[PDB]
Ligand binder design. Structure first.
Ligand SMILES: Nc1nc2c(ncn2[C@@H]2O[C@H](COP(=O)(O)OP(=O)(O)O)[C@@H](O)[C@H]2O)c(=O)[nH]1
Ligand SMILES: [Mg+2]
Length: 163
């Protein structure tokens, strides 16, 4: 169970990890490409599974190494920001990367984060669901700030691993 978070800078990759792990949320920045992995044991389907969470850098000068991390990861979490059109379009790039340096022997979860910022939404939930189905990957919308669906994200991907 190795989960790698991918997506453009500031979609909220770290916040989602931080939310799931310590159930907290900080609104300041963390330019991330440092101190690289977190672990946690979680309950599900009558058992326990320990997950390994990998946090990566979406902003450029640091995508030269990411490939390896993707290659030996069992789950790729591709995140975008529902209020940022560019972050959504770029998910094709990240998804392309995963399959290219990993085959089809992988589980991919597309995540539309920051649902709390409704008055700034640029991508509807239907458009996200439709894109996930067209590319044959999983989909879920979240909010690291409110905690919305954060646990459902991990339970679902974890469930996908056991199945
Ligand atoms: N409103 C809102 N802000 C968020 C959410 N998740 C992250 N952020 C904010 O977006 C900025 C970037 O988040 P960060 O986790 O560093 O993004 P990363 O670069 O993808 O890891 C920070 O200022 C966060 O506080 C969310 O669900 N809702
Ligand atoms: Mg980060």
């Amino acid at each position: 169970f190795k989960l790698v978070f991918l997506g453009e800078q500031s979609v909220g990759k770290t916040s989602l990890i931080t939310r799931f792990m310590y159930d907290s949320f900080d609104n300041t920045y963390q330019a991330t490409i440092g101190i690289d992995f977190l672990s946690k044991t979680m309950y599900l389907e009558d058992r326990t599974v320990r997950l390994q969470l990998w946090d990566t850098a979406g902003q450029e000068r640091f995508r030269s190494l990411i490939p390896s991390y993707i290659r030996d990861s069992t789950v790729a979490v591709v995140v975008y920001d529902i209020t940022n059109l560019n972050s959504f379009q770029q998910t094709s790039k990240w998804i392309d990367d995963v399959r290219t340096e990993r085959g089809s022997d992988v589980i991919i979860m597309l995540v539309g984060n920051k649902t709390d910022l409704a008055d700034k939404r640029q991508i509807t939930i239907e458009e996200g669901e439709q894109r996930a189905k067209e590319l044959s990957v999983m989909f879920i919308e979240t909010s690291a700030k409110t905690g919305y669906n954060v646990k459902q994200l991990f339970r679902r991907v974890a469930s996908a691993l056991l199945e």
